[PDB]
Design a binder for these strands. Sequence first.
DNA 1: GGCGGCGCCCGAACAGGGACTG
DNA 2: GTCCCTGTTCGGGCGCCG
Lengths: 546, 397
Amino acid sequence: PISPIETVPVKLKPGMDGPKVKQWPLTEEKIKALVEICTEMEKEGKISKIGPENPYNTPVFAIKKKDSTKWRKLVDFRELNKRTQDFWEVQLGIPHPAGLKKKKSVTVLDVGDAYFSVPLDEDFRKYTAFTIIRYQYNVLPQGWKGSPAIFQSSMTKILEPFRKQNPDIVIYQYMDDLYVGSDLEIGQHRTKIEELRQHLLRWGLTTPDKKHQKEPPFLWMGYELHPDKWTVQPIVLPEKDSWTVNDICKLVGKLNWASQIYPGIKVRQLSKLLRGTKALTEVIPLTEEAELELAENREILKEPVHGVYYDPSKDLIAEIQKQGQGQWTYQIYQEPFKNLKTGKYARMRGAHTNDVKQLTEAVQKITTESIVIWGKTPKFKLPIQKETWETWWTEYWQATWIPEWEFVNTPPLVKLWYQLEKEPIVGAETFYVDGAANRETKLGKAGYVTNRGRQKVVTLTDTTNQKTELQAIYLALQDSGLEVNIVTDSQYALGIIQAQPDQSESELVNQIIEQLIKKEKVYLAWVPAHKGIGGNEQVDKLVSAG
Amino acid sequence: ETVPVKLKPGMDGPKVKQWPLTEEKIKALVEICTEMEKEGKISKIGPENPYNTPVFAIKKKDSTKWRKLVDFRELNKRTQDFHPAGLKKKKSVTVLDVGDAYFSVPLDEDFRKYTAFTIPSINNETPGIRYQYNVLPQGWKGSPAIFQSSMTKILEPFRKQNPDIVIYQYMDDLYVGSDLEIGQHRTKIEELRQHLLRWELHPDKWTVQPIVLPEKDSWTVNDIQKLVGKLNWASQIYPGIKVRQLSKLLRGTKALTEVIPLTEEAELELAENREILKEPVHGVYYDPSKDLIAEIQKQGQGQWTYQIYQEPFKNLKTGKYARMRGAHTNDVKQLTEAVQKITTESIVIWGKTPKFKLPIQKETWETWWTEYWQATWIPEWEFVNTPPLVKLWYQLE
DNA sequence: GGCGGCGCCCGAACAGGGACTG
DNA sequence: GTCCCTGTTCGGGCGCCG
Ligand SMILES: Nc1ccn([C@@H]2CS[C@H](COP(=O)(O)OP(=O)(O)OP(=O)(O)O)O2)c(=O)n1
Ligand SMILES: [Mg+2]
Ligand SMILES: [Mg+2]
């Protein structure tokens, strides 16, 4: 029917008028279904015949539903949407099964004709006019900007009393889906479910029996809910022999979806298969590393896997593991090997970074995700030594911090691969390094001068001032002994190397990192440039042939 | 009887997304908002209101009672506005929460849409529950402005009878300052509290701590290079600083560990520079139009340094925040206490909070700062990667 | 072929900030 | 001012849900 709930007042953005788009031509296979739908809707008062009084129009169409025997009616309301006021979206996230608590009795209900059972603002119906006969909407149409929010809000208002007087009943409300959980025995649970159905009916909302799930496994939000296990519905990966950008996007999206319960999913190579592409219809050749990563993902997917439900009386434990190349997998669980869920974090931040920063980022992502799903921070189990972390937190000039954690010796352990001395080294040779580049010519020079009288200058082409400073440091490191003191005038190179990176998207920085790892003691010091400070001045004069 | 409120000339209301809340805070907010809705102070709204500002809760000190805090920073930026110099000079100042008095004055109807907020749900069991204010909200620029006439009526007899006391309102709090002994001051504060019902700050220790140069009887090439770099930075602040004589001590490609005696010509220059850092910075005038900038540097081991300025190198105030060097030190907790202390000091000195440059990744701060926030206001902030040299320049021995 | 939510990943646009030219 | 480097934001694809 039509809910007796108050309507939600809607306006057009100031100054705009309704749409006046002409009806796109359709087939007969859609006209027949749309007539069959619109006759019954106009009988039920959900759409009303409009006369020549409305000057507005919008094109309509229809598509097959999840069950391919029923048609869903849609309206291309893009123009009206652009002209409709702004809404505050009220759906803040997607409920997850791992946040469900074990319940003795579970029901899943689907509201029948959800949008078409919620009325629409009278002053706004004139803008919804369409033509097949000219109708206008009296209920929420599909394709309008405001319908999801207005329905979600109306469903909340309608449920509010039932929630108020049934606190021990849990209702997960995903937009017309209703998960209903209780610890009541099956008979009294079915009684309460009847109360909830009759209550929805008093507010105009039907729960058809055909979409009334009563026995496990329940289908919900893409998962199968068993009494104390939950799984995802099967994930069919495409086996395409020629790969397009759209195909890679579908594959990576399916892999991202799978990574919530399948551990160890990696998509870095398959995603890098996108760098600077053109369109959805460009064939991409799979690199060898991408082929191997995809084979690994496939072998992961052909393995039986399930998650469990949240127990609020036991601890949240997030254990993280290092994958290669800025990739990390994690498992959230409460009892060992019984995962609540799994995840991945593979976001590359900063041109230069190390594994301690990346781990900190992962710990932050997992923390916020855990607050969203369970409302608790978890207890962490990280492959990093407490000493490693303290050393980092000491030497690092940014505020960093990680919640309660305990070390787990599962390699690859997170390590700082080198340290910079806090004081200059006695007996270590002292290299003053510098470099310069001409902006117009793009040519440059990098070199070093030592206290023992060694001098080296090396010419570079197609370089910058910053690259030329990094090259000078690289020269010094290559030519120095195991212990060295280095004096630069480059706050840029200083800041990079002081951050103690172990990986970089700059090949030069990577080579610098390998050299730094090879050394036993390094002291890096900074002097201001062009100040006559010996022997920085000697290097400066040496590398300025341009 | 309500007051009309206009927004910025060409700006809209706040559209800030609500961040995730822990179960503890959600339960407290739901309790508080039920009670407030009953009393008519807030009411439920829907998605037709296009505005939103974030809400959370903080547990008060030595208390089980949570407090709802709305982050009205965006709203406060967008409401066009409509301070005693002697408060910083008083011996004692007490901060009194007077916020809930605002809940007696109704809020203009047309403006209510802008105060919308959204209580979230654990595991998104439900869509967010949206509310808006019907009275003056705690945390909004306009609430003390509208309530100011009523507040002055409240405080007239107390000011008349106690002319030596300085009462200053900043948004949700009164700052009551005097020079009385601690006990008599507390009794006067209790007089003022009884007056409010009828309807731990000492601005002396606030030392402008200087920039100090290392004192040594033996100087390596490294030490003199560090000193010349620091002085070349500091000359951007104190132009009278010379480096010539010290810089001459370095001629040649010497080893960093090589010892260098200080020539009398250079020791006199170092002494001159040491004295120059004692006199104040010239050409530094406070500007009420331009807003305050506060930089913070993490020095390590519970030590933090900060500068408050408006234009670069014209520092209005430098300082340090020194916490205990403990085993389980929480950098985020310390930084939060530091920004609270600096903001209190700015509200007392200049009457406005500063925009903070925070030496932290944005996500760590946004994830944990609420766990340690205790004030009713919130300063503006941005996130910067502090250069390795600024910390070296402001650190202590 | 329409809509809203969240997720991921990429590149385009842009905003500081350090260093430079005559 | 210019050039270079780097971090943030946002929109465009796709994935999942209804
Ligand atoms: N792709 C989609 C899917 C759903 N929707 C919206 C949001 S929820 C609403 C569900 O459609 P209906 O109310 O007609 O109900 P159903 O299609 O499930 O059938 P019945 O339950 O049998 O009555 O349609 C959409 O806009 N786009
Ligand atoms: Mg339905
Ligand atoms: Mg240089």
